[PDB]
Ligand binder design. Structure first.
Ligand SMILES: [Cl-]
Length: 401
């Protein structure tokens, strides 16, 4: 009942599942002795004894997809012993988010190039269902052994049939507006259209002979919480808890500014799904941390008017301060709410003003610039929907900034 936990080529410790179902973790002495040792999670601090808190089960369970439907698929695909976490990671824990590599108790870089036909096949087998591949030059490949992947691959997902184009667009816009986000590309293989997002939890060495995994954990993990409480309405962290947390980042000022800037950005693009698991931090040597780039960005604008949903129904996953409580409706949110929030969280008014004024003058040019990076077959309705609504909200920044 053990899975050895590795960080690149270093043994970190072991995950054990006792006979009664309890999960425990124990760091390896060689790991702890390193003057550069870092915990697996800020919720699992470095220590010599057996860790038995719920933070253990929660940390590892948060490495898996949230969806029971996706988990059944995983058990079926690898014939996993059960749907239980320990058993799923026994099958797919070799390459996961961050740098944790889980290998059953019972290297050289190598890979296999895939043909367009083969790539189409691989992708047609896949909250949503996502996989990962290794990019070598302009070819998509399957890594061999412990060789890591470099890109998260997402398939189309309320008609969220254009979620691939939606996210591509949002990521391009975020980058154009100065936000820290991964690059992405729309890949076409036969009749499949998927989004390949470059992973920021991976890094090639200078000579390109070794691809390293970078340790990171999302906000539920960092707080020892189960994925079940990822939404603030369920007791999960919101802007206040995360901002407080970021005070201790090795890049406090830049991370708080970036996180606040991103809240304004989600509001402008109608991103209604920015829950706690959509934020992560890199865990660095010694246990210090800093915010990773932003990810999993999708606009709810292209889904408007569909199932009868109006713009008035769009709500931010993490609310802002309101005179009498919180402000969550994108359609009712204005700059005063961001400034009121900045104030109570001790985020400088001058910085909040800069963020608002920068979007005020840059949005129109950013929207035009993004168009050159869209493929000829990009769905116009997505551009139309996001563009018109972003400009509509952007007007509110101009009637003051
Ligand atoms: Cl509201």
């Amino acid at each position: 009942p053990k899975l050895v936990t590795w960080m690149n080529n270093q043994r970190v410790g072991e995950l054990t599942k006792l006979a009664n179902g309890a999960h425990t973790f124990k760091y390896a002495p060689e790991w702890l002795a390193s003057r550069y040792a870092r915990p697996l999670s800020l919720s699992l601090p470095l220590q010599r004894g057996n860790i038995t808190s719920d933070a253990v089960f929660n940390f590892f369970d948060n490495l898996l997809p949230d969806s029971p439907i996706v988990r059944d698929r995983i058990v079926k695909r690898y014939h996993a012993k059960s749907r239980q976490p320990f058993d799923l990671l026994s099958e797919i824990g070799r390459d996961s988010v961050g740098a944790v590599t889980l290998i059953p108790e019972d290297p050289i870089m190598a890979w296999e190039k895939l043909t367009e036909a083969r790539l189409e096949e691989v992708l047609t087998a896949y909250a949503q269902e996502k996989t990962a591949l290794l990019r070598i030059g302009n070819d998509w490949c399957i890594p061999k052994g412990i060789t890591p992947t470099t890109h998260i691959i997402k398939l189309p997902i309320l008609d969220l049939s254009q979620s691939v184009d939606n996210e591509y667009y949002c990521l391009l816009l975020a980058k154009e507006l100065g936000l820290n986000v991964p690059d992405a590309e729309i890949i076409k293989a036969g009749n499949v259209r998927a989004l390949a997002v470059e992973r920021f939890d991976r890094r090639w060495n200078a000579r390109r002979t070794v691809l390293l995994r970078l340790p990171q954990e999302d906000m539920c993990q960092t707080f020892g919480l189960p994925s079940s409480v990822k939404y603030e309405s369920d007791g999960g962290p919101g802007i206040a808890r995360i901002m407080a947390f970021l005070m201790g980042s090795s890049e406090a000022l830049k991370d708080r500014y970036d996180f606040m800037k991103f809240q304004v950005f989600q509001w402008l693009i109608g991103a209604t799904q920015g829950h706690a698991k959509n934020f992560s931090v890199f865990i660095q040597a010694g246990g210090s941390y800093r915010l990773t780039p932003f990810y999993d960005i999708i606009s709810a604008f292209p889904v408007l008017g569909g199932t009868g949903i109006h713009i008035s129904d769009l709500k931010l996953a993490m609310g802002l301060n309101a005179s009498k409580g919180k402000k969550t409706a994108i359609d009712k949110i204005y700059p005063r709410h961001f400034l009121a929030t900045a104030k109570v969280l001790r985020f400088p008014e001058v910085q909040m003003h800069e963020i608002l004024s920068d979007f005020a003058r840059m949005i129109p040019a950013a929207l035009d610039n993004v168009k050159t990076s869209l493929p000829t077959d990009f769905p116009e309705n997505v551009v139309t929907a996001v563009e018109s609504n972003v400009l509509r909200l952007h007007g509110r920044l101009s009637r003051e900034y």
